[PDB]
Scaffold this active site. Structure first.
Site, short mmCIF file in Angstrom:
data_model
loop_
_atom_site.label_atom_id
_atom_site.label_comp_id
_atom_site.label_asym_id
_atom_site.label_seq_id
_atom_site.Cartn_x
_atom_site.Cartn_y
_atom_site.Cartn_z
N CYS A 270 -2.34 0.55 -13.51
CA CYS A 270 -2.44 0.58 -12.07
C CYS A 270 -3.63 1.48 -11.75
O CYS A 270 -4.67 1.40 -12.42
CB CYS A 270 -1.12 1.03 -11.42
SG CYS A 270 -0.26 2.47 -12.11
N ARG B 50 3.50 2.51 -10.93
CA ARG B 50 3.81 1.09 -11.06
C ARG B 50 3.83 0.64 -12.52
O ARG B 50 4.65 -0.19 -12.91
CB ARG B 50 2.77 0.25 -10.29
CG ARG B 50 2.75 0.51 -8.81
CD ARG B 50 1.62 -0.20 -8.14
NE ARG B 50 1.36 0.38 -6.84
CZ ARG B 50 0.40 -0.01 -6.02
NH1 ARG B 50 -0.42 -0.99 -6.40
NH2 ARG B 50 0.27 0.57 -4.83
N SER B 51 2.89 1.15 -13.32
CA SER B 51 2.86 0.85 -14.75
C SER B 51 4.16 1.29 -15.42
O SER B 51 4.69 0.57 -16.27
CB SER B 51 1.66 1.54 -15.41
OG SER B 51 0.43 1.01 -14.95
N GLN C 250 6.54 7.84 -10.38
CA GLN C 250 5.93 8.91 -9.61
C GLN C 250 6.75 9.35 -8.41
O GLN C 250 6.45 10.41 -7.85
CB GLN C 250 4.57 8.46 -9.09
CG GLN C 250 3.46 8.47 -10.09
CD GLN C 250 2.16 7.93 -9.49
OE1 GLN C 250 2.05 6.73 -9.16
NE2 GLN C 250 1.18 8.80 -9.33
N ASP D 79 0.83 -1.22 0.00
CA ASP D 79 0.00 0.00 0.00
C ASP D 79 0.86 1.26 0.00
O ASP D 79 0.55 2.23 -0.70
CB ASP D 79 -0.93 0.04 1.22
CG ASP D 79 -2.31 -0.57 0.97
OD1 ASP D 79 -2.50 -1.30 -0.03
OD2 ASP D 79 -3.22 -0.32 1.81
#
Ligand SMILES: c1cnc(Oc2ccc(-c3cc[nH]n3)cc2)nc1
Length: 282
Positions: free
Chosen positions: A215, A221-222, A262, A181
């Site tokens: 994502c 994450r992508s 990110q 998370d």
């Protein structure tokens, strides 16, 4: 510089935030006018994540062709990817229309439906064989064929039928279920194992349309997934693998979609994954 020793040098000097801000400053800026039209407000999950006009995927529809999705075409590596946001309640039909129209074989999902107590994307695939889904706005039917649940990820076989033409196709759903998370994984070993499973399925290969990877926003994450895949492929193709520059590859990918990677932690994790994956290759 090489990768593994540039890495140690940034760790010892604690300058990951400064490296990452340089990337942000140098990244391309292109218009995204279609994304910001008022009729498309409820087609966007986040107001600050939009596809560029020049690389956006168009739906084959004359009313409204917009979906928050971008084609990343990597010329030297000979790989393409579609990066998209996690589907919204009012775009689940558009999502599967895109998969159909672009002739994709595989879908890569890097989030859970609920994270941090909030919904990160819609439940856009069926959970039971006998309870299929019908998308009436785009005239598609989707059926769960099989499901294989492993410790770090789940693979599903799905059947997508175009109800207009009665054609059917097999879609593979690759779901990484254990990204934490908060932060990034401590070791890249499970993420690399997952990438190799996607590769082994044919879903990344030129005989099919581009894989669809998402994502929640379709940039963090992508971005990690496609950045690692592309860098490893280049290290196999070139005479000098130490000539692969992960920052230059990332900036090339950011010509096609904004914001890829990110955080500085995601950047460091991307370095780690490529370094560790190069060995396993031989
Ligand atoms: C077939 C049936 N229903 C739909 O629409 C929706 C599906 C799932 C959600 C949902 C709820 C919580 N998370 N995702 C919302 C709307 N699309 C095709």
């Amino acid at each position: 510089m090489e990768m593994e020793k540039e890495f140690e040098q940034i760790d010892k000097s604690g300058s990951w935030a400064a490296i990452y801000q340089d990337i942000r400053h140098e990244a391309s800026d292109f218009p995204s006018r279609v994304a910001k039209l008022p009729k498309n407000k409820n087609r966007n999950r986040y107001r600050d994540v939009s596809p560029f006009d020049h690389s956006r995927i168009k739906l084959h529809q004359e009313d409204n062709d917009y979906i928050n999705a971008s084609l990343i075409k990597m010329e030297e590596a000979q790989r393409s990817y579609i990066l998209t946001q996690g589907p919204l309640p009012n775009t689940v039909g558009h999502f599967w229309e895109m998969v159909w129209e672009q002739k994709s074989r595989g879908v890569v999902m890097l989030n859970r439906v609920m994270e941090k107590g909030s919904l990160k994307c819609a439940q856009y695939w069926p959970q039971k064989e006998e309870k299929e889904m019908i998308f009436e706005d785009t005239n598609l039917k989707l059926t769960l064929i099989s499901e294989d649940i492993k410790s770090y990820y789940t693979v599903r076989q799905l059947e997508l039928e175009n109800l207009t033409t009665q054609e059917t196709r097999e879609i593979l759903h690759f779901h990484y279920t254990t990204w934490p998370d908060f932060g990034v994984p401590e070791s890249p070993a499970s993420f690399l194992n997952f990438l190799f499973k996607v590769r082994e399925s044919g879903s990344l290969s030129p005989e099919h349309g581009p894989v669809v990877v998402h994502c929640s926003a379709g940039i963090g994450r992508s971005g990690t997934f496609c950045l690692a895949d592309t860098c490893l492929l280049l290290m196999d193709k070139r005479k000098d693998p130490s000539s692969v520059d992960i920052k230059k590859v990332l900036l090339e990918m950011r010509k096609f979609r904004m914001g890829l990677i990110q955080t500085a932690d995601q950047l460091r994790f991307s370095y780690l994954a490529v370094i560790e994956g190069a060995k396993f290759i031989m």
